[PDB]
Amino acid sequence: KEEHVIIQAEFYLNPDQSGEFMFDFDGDEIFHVDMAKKETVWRLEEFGRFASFEAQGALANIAVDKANLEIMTKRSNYTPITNVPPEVTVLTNSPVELREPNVLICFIDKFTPPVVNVTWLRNGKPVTTGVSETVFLPREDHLFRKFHYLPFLPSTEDVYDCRVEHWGLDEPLLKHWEFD
Amino acid sequence: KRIAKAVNEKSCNCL
Amino acid sequence: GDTRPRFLEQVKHECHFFNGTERVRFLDRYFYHQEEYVRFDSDVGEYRAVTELGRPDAEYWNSQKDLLEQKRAAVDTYCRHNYGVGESFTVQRRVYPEVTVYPAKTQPLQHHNLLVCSVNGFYPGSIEVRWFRNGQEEKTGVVSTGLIQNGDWTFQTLVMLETVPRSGEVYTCQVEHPSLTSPLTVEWRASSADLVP
C-alpha cells in the first residue's frame, strides 16, 4: 500500500473561462497559482521558506487545458457537465468555550462543476470581515471540495449559518451552528 | 529548491 | 441567473510513493467533466485510451518518441524530485494533538451519558483513539466522527463513549499517533463531576 501521493491538479471551465492550478499532498493543498497576479500562493506561509515554484509555468499549462477543453467539447458533441450538488458540514476548529476565540469551518464536499457561492451569516447577515477560503480541492472521484473559515468569539447571543449556492441545488443550502 | 511542473500534452484537433 | 451549460477539463499529474521513494508510480490523467479519457501510467509505459473520447490522443501522443521518453523519465525528473523538495514539510510534518475529555451533558452519576474525547489539530491523519473504564478497554458503545480534515494541514476527531458512570470510576482516553515521543492519555474522573452526591 502506498505511503503518499502528490498530485498537480488543474482545471479549465467554459464558458466561465475559469481555471486553477494546484498541488495536493495526501489530500491537503501545498499551493496554488493566482493566475491573475501570476503568483505562487502557499497554503501555509512556512511552505515557501525553502521551496519555490515558477508561477508563469501554470499559465502555459492552463492555456493547454483550454485548448484541450475546446477539442473535447467538440468530440463529445457538446455534452455538458451534470451538476452534482454539494454536501455541506459546519464544524468548529476546537471545542467551543464562551469568550474563547474559535473558528467556524464550512466544508463543502462532493460537488461539480467547481463554481459555488458561499456566504457566512451571523444572525442572518453576511459576514465579509475576517473570512477566508480555499481554492477548489480535487477528490479521487473527480468532484471537488472546498473550505470557508470564520474566526469568531463564541457567545450565547449569536447564531451562524454557512449558505451555499450551487447549480445542482434546488434552493440555497443553509447549515447552522449555535452555542451548545 | 524548485518544484518541477508536469507539462500537459495537446490533444489532436483531429479534423 | 446564468444556467448556461458548462464544460470542464481536468488534468491530474499524480505521483504515488511506496516505501519512501523505493517504488514510484506516475500517472498523467486527463478528464472531461469527471470522465478520465486518456492516461499515461508509468507501469505501462505508454498512453492508453480510458474511454473512446481519448482514442485519438493515445495514438497521436504514443507516435511521438521524445514525448514518451519524457513521460517515462517523470518518476525521477518529477516525482522523486518533488518528493525531495517537499519532504521536510509534508512527509515529515508531525503536529501533536490537543486532547480534551468532557461529558456531553451535565448528568448526575448512575445515569446514561456520552463521554467525549476531542482530539484536535493533529497531523498526519493516521491515529488510534481508545477508551478505557478503570483500565479495561471499552469496545462497544464507541462512536466517532471519523477523521475530519480541517483544510489547513490539521485533522480532528471526536470519539465518544456511551456509559453509565458511577462514583470512583476513572475513564481514560488514549491516543496513539506518529507525533508522540511518549504516551498520551487524558482522564475523566467520575467523582470530579458528582452533580448530586
Q: Where are the domains of chain A?
A: 1-80, 81-180
Taking alpha carbons only, the member of A98, A164, A153 closest to residue A129 is: A153
Distance (Å, rounded) from C-alpha C123 to C-alpha A158? 32
- β-pairing, A18-25 vs A28-34, is antiparallel
Answer whether B6 touches A (CB < 8 Å): yes
Q: SS in 3 state form for C54-120?
A: HHHHHHHHHCCHHHHHHHHCHHHHHHHHHHHHHHHHCCCCCECCEEEEEECCCCCCCCCEEEEEEEE
Residue C168 identity (one-letter amino acid) = G
Q: Do A61 and B11 touch (CB under 8 A)?
A: no
DSSP 3-state assignment of B11?
coil
CATH T-level assignment (fold) for domain A1-80:
3.10.320
- What phi-psi label fits residue C20: left (phi over 0), alpha (psi between -120 and 50 degrees) or beta? left
Q: Do A8 and B5 touch (CB under 8 A)?
A: yes
DSSP E strands: which ranges in chain A?
4-14, 18-25, 28-34, 39-42, 87-92, 102-111, 117-122, 125-126, 132-133, 137-138, 144-152, 159-165, 173-178
First to last CA, chain B: 43
User: C1-91: which CATH architecture?
Assistant: Roll (3.10)
DSSP-assigned letter for residue A150: E
C-alpha cell recorded at residue C197: 452526591
Answer whether B15 touches C (CB < 8 Å): no
Distance (Å, rounded) from C-alpha A159 to C-alpha C145? 23
Question: Given in angstroms, what resolution was this structure solved at?
Answer: 1.4
Q: How far is CA C67 from the centre of its chain?
A: 35
Instruction: Return the bridge partners of A57, or none.
Output: none
Contacts of C196 (CB under 8 A, 6+ apart): C108, C109
Which residues of B fall within a CB distance of 8 Å from A53?
Answer: 2-3, 5
Handedness of CA A59, A65, A67, A73 (dihedral sign): negative
Residue C87 identity (one-letter amino acid) = E
Size of interface B-C (CB pairs under 8 A): 32
C32 φ, ψ (degrees, to nearest 5):
-115, 110
Which residues of B fall within a CB distance of 8 Å from A65?
Answer: 8
CATH T-level assignment (fold) for domain C92-197:
Immunoglobulin-like (2.60.40)
Superfamily of chain region A81-180? Immunoglobulins (2.60.40.10)
DSSP 3-state assignment of A10?
strand
Q: Do C6 and A27 touch (CB under 8 A)?
A: no
Count of beta carbons in the 10 Å neighbourhood of residue A24: 21
Mutate to test the interface with B, among C46, C85, C87, C90 (most CBs of B within 10 A): C85
Q: Do C84 and B1 touch (CB under 8 A)?
A: yes
Which amino acids of C are annotated as binding site, given as ranges? 57, 61, 81-82, 93
Answer whether B3 touches C (CB < 8 Å): yes
Distance (Å, rounded) from C-alpha C50 to C-alpha C141? 45
Place of cell 457566512: A120
Inter-residue contact C184 to C124 (CB < 8 Å): no
Answer whether C139 touches A (CB < 8 Å): no
Q: How far is CA A42 from CA A35, A45, A47, A55, A76, in A?
A: 14, 6, 6, 11, 36
Residue A43 identity (one-letter amino acid) = R
C-alpha cell recorded at residue B12: 489532436
Answer whether A112 touches C (CB < 8 Å): yes
Option in B2, B3, B11 nearest C57 (CB): B11
For chain A positions 137-176, those within 8 Å of chain C (CB to CB) are 137-138, 141-143, 147, 149, 167
- Same fold for the pair A1-80 and A81-180: no
